[PDB]
Design an enzyme around this catalytic site. Structure first.
Site, PDB file in Angstrom:
ATOM      1  N   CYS A 237      22.360 -27.542   5.001  1.00 55.69           N
ATOM      2  CA  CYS A 237      22.939 -26.939   3.783  1.00 55.69           C
ATOM      3  C   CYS A 237      23.732 -28.066   3.138  1.00 55.69           C
ATOM      4  O   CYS A 237      23.140 -29.106   2.857  1.00 55.69           O
ATOM      5  CB  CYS A 237      23.741 -25.674   4.111  1.00 55.69           C
ATOM      6  N   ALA A 239      27.283 -29.074   4.377  1.00 53.59           N
ATOM      7  CA  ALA A 239      27.894 -29.728   5.566  1.00 53.59           C
ATOM      8  C   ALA A 239      26.968 -29.636   6.774  1.00 53.59           C
ATOM      9  O   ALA A 239      27.168 -30.447   7.720  1.00 53.59           O
ATOM     10  CB  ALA A 239      29.224 -29.108   5.862  1.00 53.59           C
ATOM     11  N   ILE A 241      26.696 -26.845   8.802  1.00 54.38           N
ATOM     12  CA  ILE A 241      27.308 -26.030   9.882  1.00 54.38           C
ATOM     13  C   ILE A 241      27.399 -24.534   9.570  1.00 54.38           C
ATOM     14  O   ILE A 241      27.108 -23.756  10.452  1.00 54.38           O
ATOM     15  CB  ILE A 241      28.671 -26.617  10.316  1.00 54.38           C
ATOM     16  N   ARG A 243      25.996 -22.173   6.765  1.00 53.66           N
ATOM     17  CA  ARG A 243      24.672 -21.571   6.531  1.00 53.66           C
ATOM     18  C   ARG A 243      23.691 -22.079   7.586  1.00 53.66           C
ATOM     19  O   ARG A 243      22.960 -21.318   8.104  1.00 53.66           O
ATOM     20  CB  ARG A 243      24.260 -21.897   5.090  1.00 53.66           C
TER      21      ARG A 243
END
Length: 306
Positions: A237, A239, A241, A243
């Protein structure tokens, strides 16, 4: 787009469905699990000891966010890599729960920066990743860039140093997915180029959740057919982490139920394991609830008419 299950697999899906449905019927139980996971979080100062390569002065500009970096123990390494001082660094983590031909492994990674797109495609080739799952827009409605354009070739063939990228076709679905059959290779044409299916979903807001589970479950339905032995599934996504962790949790839970792993009924344990593999996987309580809802909805599809 239909699975033939064994008697064993159907019994395990029914057993799992009763448990997950009971959790959604007692939502205080789900909220309590997430509050407990947050109480047991890793603190940012820990990254200075467990993520030394990511925190290196040579690598800091290769991170979209300063506090979302892979652990040294399971980071994906570029090998070969053009700069030995970088130690092969890419912001990417191996997510692996099981050693089974029936359970996918993932590479959880950040949305590529303009200066890490060659690194990203080099990782795709070196790890022979058959799939990229993209769960973000390039730019949000507050006008923040969330991910660089590493895949559109409307002008002409894309180049990333030694790497060329070409689109074989683009296809949309009724559920808003964008399917791109991509072809990537080095310019020295030793062998046939590599095919990668790119799946993009633009209706999952940053730090939020989709309005329903249908598009996310269609991604899993399209990937049921992809043998885990073909290589890791890239999931990203912005970052990589929140989603990303939510998608991985749904995909991993369903596969492990179908493979007979009783421990997949403990979603909190799965998320804690994911967090031991990439800091902060599953960012919000709404994302944690969405995991439960998607897993219930998919188990209802898998058991329909049985």
């Amino acid at each position: 787009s239909k699975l033939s299950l064994s008697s064993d697999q159907l019994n395990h899906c029914h057993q799992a469905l009763g448990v997950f449905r009971g959790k959604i019927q007692n939502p205080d139980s789900i909220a309590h699990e997430f509050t407990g996971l947050q109480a047991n979080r890793m603190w940012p100062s820990e990254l200075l000891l467990n993520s030394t390569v990511a925190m290196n002065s040579v690598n800091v500009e290769k991170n979209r966010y300063s506090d979302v970096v892979p652990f040294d123990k399971n980071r994906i390494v570029l090998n070969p890599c053009k700069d030995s001082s970088a130690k092969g660094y890419v912001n990417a983590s191996l997510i692996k729960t099981s050693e089974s031909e029936s359970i996918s492994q993932f590479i959880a990674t950040q949305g590529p920066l303009p200066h890490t797109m060659e690194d990203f495609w080099e990782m795709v080739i070196q790890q022979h990743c058959p799939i990229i799952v993209m769960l973000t827009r390039l730019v949000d409605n507050n006008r923040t860039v969330k991910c660089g354009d590493y895949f559109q070739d409307e002008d002409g063939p894309r180049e990333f140093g030694n790497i060329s990228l070409t689109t074989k076709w683009i296809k949309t679905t009724d559920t808003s997915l964008m399917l791109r059959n991509l072809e990537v290779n080095y310019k020295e044409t030793e062998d046939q180029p590599m095919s990668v299916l790119h799946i993009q979903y633009p209706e999952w807001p940053d730090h939020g959740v989709p309005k329903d589970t249908v598009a996310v479950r269609e991604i899993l339905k399209r990937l049921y057919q992809v043998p885990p032995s073909l290589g890791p599934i890239i999931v990203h996504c912005s970052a990589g982490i929140g989603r990303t962790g939510t998608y991985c949790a749904i995909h991993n839970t369903i596969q492990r139920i179908l493979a007979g792993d009783m421990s997949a009924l403990d979603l909190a344990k799965t998320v804690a394991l994911f967090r031991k593999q990439r800091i902060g996987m599953v960012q919000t309580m709404d994302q944690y609830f969405f995991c439960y809802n998607a897993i219930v909805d998919e188990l209802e599809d898998l058991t329909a008419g049985t």
